[PDB]
Amino acid sequence: AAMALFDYNATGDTEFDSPAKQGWMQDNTNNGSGVLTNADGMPAWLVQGIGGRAQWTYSLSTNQHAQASSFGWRMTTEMKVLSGGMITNYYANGTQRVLPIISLDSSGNLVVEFEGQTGRTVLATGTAATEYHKFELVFLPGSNPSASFYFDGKLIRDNIQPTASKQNMIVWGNGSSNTDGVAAYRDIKFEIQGD
């Protein structure tokens, strides 16, 4: 030991055909919604943050928060952004978060921002901007805790400093009631490491 993994895996299976059935909590407001969809012969969960917030949350236990802090963690998302912004797939711990905010800019490019930084980074232009990609957030602890962001396995930004936050969920989706955001999710993992 010791390691742990928490996931949503998009599936047609009845027993597990929403995130609610994989231990995640629906956390929409207003007009926000979601539904199982099927795209490339493959299930995806379509998050529809149109006129309301639309996201899913997962609760770590007391020891899991603490283990996450000692040994570090990795959050991987496989998604495709369809429209808008505040696509917020992230982890908060009662005290801090590394928040990447993903979107499509007014030129149609897939950009990423991080809370604590200012500016956007172009991840994909053209028809690439609105296809599936694999996004990794990798948190390395120490007395100098920083994060690294990866896009189909390519270091994009490192030395991302955590920022204060009272929230304490693993979250994915459109974490915003006013910024509309739409994306499809095949996979979410949050893995707590060993040493």
Ligand X SMILES: CC(=O)N[C@H]1[C@H]([C@H](O)[C@H](O)CO)O[C@@](O[C@H]2[C@@H](O)[C@@H](CO)O[C@@H](O[C@H]3[C@H](O)[C@@H](O)[C@H](O)O[C@@H]3CO)[C@@H]2O)(C(=O)O)C[C@@H]1O
Residue with tokens 């390395």: 140
61 binds Ca ion (CB under 5 A): yes
Single out the residue of 34, 49, 85, 175 in contact with ligand X (rule: CB under 6 A): 175
Q: Does 48 bind ligand X (CB under 6 A)?
A: no
Nearest to 101 by CA among 183, 192, 45: 183
Residue type, 1: A
Residue 29 interacting with ligand X (CB under 6 A): yes
Q: What angle do CA 36, 11, 7 make, to 5 degrees?
A: 105
Binding mask 59-88 vs ligand X (x if CB under 6 A, - otherwise)?
Answer: -----------------------------x
Residues 132-151 that bind ligand X (CB under 6 A): none
Q: Which stretch binds ligand X (CB under 6 A): 66-74, 120-128, 139-147, 169-177?
A: 169-177
Which has the closest alpha carbon to 99: 108, 107, 86, 90?
Answer: 90
Per-residue CA distances from 77 to 1, 66, 74 (Å)? 24, 23, 10
Interacting residues with Ca ion (CB under 5 A) = 61, 63
